[PDB]
Amino acid sequence: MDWDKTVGAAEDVRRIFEHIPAILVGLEGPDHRFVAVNAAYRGFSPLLDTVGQPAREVYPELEGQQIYEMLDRVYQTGEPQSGSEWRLQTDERYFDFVVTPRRRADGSIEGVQLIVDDVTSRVRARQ
Amino acid sequence: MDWDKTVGAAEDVRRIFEHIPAILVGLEGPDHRFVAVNAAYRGFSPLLDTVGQPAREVYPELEGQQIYEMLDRVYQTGEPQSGSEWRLQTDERYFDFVVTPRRRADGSIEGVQLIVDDVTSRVRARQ
């Protein structure tokens, strides 16, 4: 595959990614280091300067919630996970997400990436 | 904003974009030229080699459906549009999508990008 012709030029693709109207995040390695985050992501979690750092290292408080257990499973097994209405902590929100593995040409897993959707309105609509 | 530090390095971001588990597409200019498409996009529309070309020029049959009317409105006005269960043609499918404008530093619109979701199962479930 010629990436420039079939996906797009790297700079252009990044500019589109940045602006996609959905929370997008890419992670690399066993320690889930941030490699790509967009504006909808950075607005969802404004406490940041994330690229290059392990997810645990920038969000130390999220150990108990085990978002990290689920990320490790995806990275170790290659099995994608979807979740609905996973709750979080303010500075009470609910999230749908799909996490998939990223494989190299050799079939090994280099990382995971996610799409996240904020569905708090649907849940808080529990009157 | 330092893009490498806040979004990610251009190559890395493109690799994550490619693998996002959602149909993603970026367009540029008035003629909606393809600048970025991912694997979920290219699987959704396999009749391709799209990057660099106007949407009308690669999909000449879609003039009547006026997906192009809606793309022009977003590009001209800056008003985002969302659609539900817009139908298409086989080689009978239904699509949710969100299209937004992309603004330059000067506030002018350079293009649009979309996220598309295939919701045919929900609709074909009209027994």
From Swiss-Prot, chains A, B:
Protein modification: Autophosphorylated.
Q: Where is the PAC domain?
A: 82-127
Instruction: List where this protein forms a coiled coil.
Output: none
What job does the chain carry out? Primarily acts as an independent SigF regulator that is sensitive to the osmosensory signal, mediating the cross talk of PknD with the SigF regulon. Possesses both phosphatase and kinase activities. The kinase domain functions as a classic anti-sigma factor-like kinase to phosphorylate the anti-anti-sigma factor domain at the canonical regulatory site, and the phosphatase domain antagonizes this activity.
Q: What is this protein called?
A: Multidomain regulatory protein MT1410
Organism expressing this protein natively: Mycobacterium tuberculosis (strain CDC 1551 / Oshkosh)
